[PDB]
Write a protein that binds this ligand. Structure first.
Ligand SMILES: NCCc1c[nH]c2ccc(O)cc12
Ligand SMILES: [Ca+2]
Length: 223
C-alpha cells in the first residue's frame, strides 16, 4: 500500500496473508473454512495465515492453516486478468473471534463514489521498494467505470473496477495482490492489477466481487 497508514493490529480481522515460505499475497476470510483471493495468486503449497499484524513476529493472535484445495475461476485469463478470483479451502476451520472474522459478501454491487478500505503487506513505495512488516490500510473511493476505461483503454472488462486517486500517490501495490477492498462492511473488490503503483492517471484495478457471489456460494456448497 502506497500512501496509506498503519491499520492497527488485528483491526482488519478478515485480512489473511498467503504464505509459501514468505508472504506473497493477501486474501479475505469469507467463512470459517474459505478464503477469497486473486487467481493471479495461485500456486501450490499455500499456508493461510490469519490473525496477522507483523508477518515476521509471532504476536499471539495468529492461526496458521494449510490450504486443502484451491479453485481458480473457470474463466480466469492470465493475459487480460479477466475473472481474477480464486477460492482457497482451509484444511481445518478457523476459530472465529474478534481478531479473526469473516467479511460479508455483497448482495448488491457498489457504485462509483463509495468509500472503501484497501489493505495489505505490499510495497509502500511508488518508486523504489520497501515492504512493511505490519498491515497497511488505505481509504479510497470507487471510480466511475468511464474514468476507469479512459485510464486503461482496451483493458477494463465488466468484471473490473478502478478505485483510488487519479492524482497519484495513494494505491495498492505489489504484494497487496489478492487482498480486500471492503466498502460498508462488504467485500466488493480484490487487488488485481494496475500500471505501476500510485501513478498519476493510473488507479488500481480490482476484481468486481459482486459478479462472483453466485459462483462463490455454489462452489462452497459443493466443496
Ligand atoms: N494497484 C496494485 C496493482 C498490482 C498488483 N500487483 C502488482 C505488482 C506490481 C505493480 O507495480 C502493481 C501491482
Ligand atoms: Ca505475526
Amino acid at each position: 500500500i502506497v500512501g496509506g497508514y498503519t491499520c492497527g493490529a488485528n483491526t482488519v480481522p478478515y485480512q489473511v496473508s498467503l504464505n509459501s515460505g514468505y508472504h506473497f499475497c493477501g486474501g479475505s476470510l469469507i467463512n470459517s473454512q474459505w478464503v477469497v483471493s486473486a487467481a493471479h495468486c495461485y500456486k501450490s503449497g499455500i499456508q493461510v495465515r490469519l490473525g496477522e499484524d507483523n508477518i515476521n513476529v509471532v504476536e499471539g493472535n495468529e492461526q496458521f492453516i494449510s490450504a486443502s484445495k484451491s479453485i481458480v475461476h473457470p474463466s480466469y485469463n492470465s493475459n487480460t486478468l479477466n475473472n481474477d478470483i480464486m477460492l482457497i479451502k482451509l484444511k481445518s476451520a478457523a476459530s472465529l473471534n474478534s481478531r479473526v472474522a469473516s467479511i460479508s459478501l455483497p448482495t448488491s454491487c457498489a457504485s462509483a463514489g463509495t468509500q472503501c478500505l484497501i489493505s495489505g503487506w505490499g510495497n509502500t513505495k511508488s518508486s523504489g521498494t520497501s515492504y512493511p512488516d505490519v498491515l497497511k490500510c488505505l481509504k479510497a473511493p470507487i471510480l466511475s467505470d468511464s474514468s476507469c476505461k479512459s485510464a486503461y483503454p482496451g483493458q477494463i472488462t465488466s468484471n473490473m473496477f478502478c478505485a483510488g486517486y487519479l492524482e497519484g500517490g495513494k494505491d495498492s501495490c505489489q504484494g497487496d495482490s489478492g487482498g480486500p477492498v471492503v466498502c460498508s462492511g462488504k467485500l466488493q473488490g480484490i487487488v488485481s492489477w494496475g500500471s505501476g503503483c500510485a501513478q498519476k492517471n493510473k488507479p488500481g484495478v480490482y476484481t468486481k466481487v459482486c459478479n462472483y457471489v453466485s459462483w462463490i456460494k455454489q462452489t462452497i456448497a459443493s466443496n
